[PDB]
Ligand SMILES: O=C(O)c1ccnc(-c2cc(NC(=O)c3ccc(O)cc3)ccc2O)c1
Ligand SMILES: [Mn+2]
C-alpha cells in the first residue's frame with residue numbers, strides 16, 4: 001500500500017472465523033500502513049439478537065466534554081457528571097439542544113463539527129465496562145479474541161480495564177476522541193453496535209513522528225511538562241491545520257455494524273454523528289512487541305497504562321533478551337513490514 005490509504009475489507013464467512021489470521025491477511029495487503037482499516041462482516045453475521053434490554057443499563061461516569069481553543073487547535077477538558085442510564089442518555093442525546101443537525105453531504109456535517117466544537121458541551125458516556133455480545137458469538141468476539149495480549153493476564157493476573165477487557169462507549173452529537181495512539185502503542189478494535197455514524201481521522205504510522213513534532217510546537221508548555229503529552233488524549237487538531245502544515249492523513253466514516261481496526265503507533269481522532277454505541281478493546285500481534293519496547297509513555301502522572309514487556313521478550317525474542325535487559329538492543333522499527341504471522345500469505 002504505497003499511498004498508505006485507509007482500506008475497507010469484506011471477508012466472506014469462511015475468512016471471518018479466525019481473527020488473528022484475518023488481521024495478518026490485511027497486513028499482507030498493507031492496510032496497516034494507513035494506521036486504520038475498516039472491516040465489514042458478512043451479512044450473515046450478528047453479535048446480538050436485539051438491543052432492547054439496554055435502556056436500564058447504567059453509565060457509572062458520564063463525562064461532559066468542554067472544549068477550549070481556536071484556529072484548528074483545541075484542548076478538551078473532561079468534567080465528570082453523575083451516573084445515568086441508557087434510557088436517560090438517549091433522551092438527552094435526541095433532545096433538541098443536543099441532537100444532530102440536518103445536512104446534505106458529509107463535508108457539511110464535518111464543517112459544522114469543527115465550527116461548533118466549543119459550544120453546547122455534550123455528554124459522552126465513555127469507559128463503560130461491559131459487552132453487548134451474546135455469549136455464543138465465537139467469531140470476532142471483542143470480549144475474548146484470543147491474541148497474545150492474553151499473555152498479560154495469564155502470567156500475572158493483571159486486568160487493565162479497556163485494554164484487555166472490553167469498553168462500551170455511548171456517544172451523542174459532537175462527542176469526540178482526541179489525537180492518540182493506543183496505550184503501549186497496541187492495536188485496537190472498535191465495533192459500532194448501533195445508531196449514528198462515527199467519523200475517524202488517521203495518520204500513517206510512518207509519519208506519526210511528524211505529528212508529534214507539530215504537536216510539541218503548538219503546545220510547548222505541555223511538551224515541556226511531559227515526555228508524551230498526547231497520551232493525555234486531550235488534544236484536538238483540525239484536518240485543515242494538518243493540511244496547512246503538510247501532515248499526511250486520511251478520513252473514514254464508520255457506520256453501525258462495521259469494525260475499525262487501529263494499528264501500532266497509528267495516531268487517530270474523530271467524532272460521533274449522533275446517539276450511538278460502540279464497543280472497544282486493545283489487542284496485539286508479534287509485530288506489536290517491538291513497538292511495545294520502544295513506546296514513550298506519559299511521564300507526569302500515576303495510574304497510566306504501563307505494561308511490563310519482560311514476558312513478551314523472553315517468549316518471542318529470546319535471542320535479544322540479554323541485550324535488551326542490558327539496554328543495548330538498538331533495533332530500529334520499519335513501519336511498513338507486516339506481522340510474521342502472514343507467512344501463510
Ligand atoms: O471515542 C471512541 O470511540 C474512541 C475511538 C478510538 N479510541 C478511543 C480511545 C479513548 C481513550 N481515552 C480517551 O480518549 C480519554 C480522554 C480523556 C480522559 O480523561 C480519559 C480518556 C483511550 C484509548 C482509546 O483507544 C476512543
Ligand atoms: Mn484509540
Ligand SMILES: [Zn+2]
Nearest residue numbers: 226298299300
Ligand atoms: Zn503526562
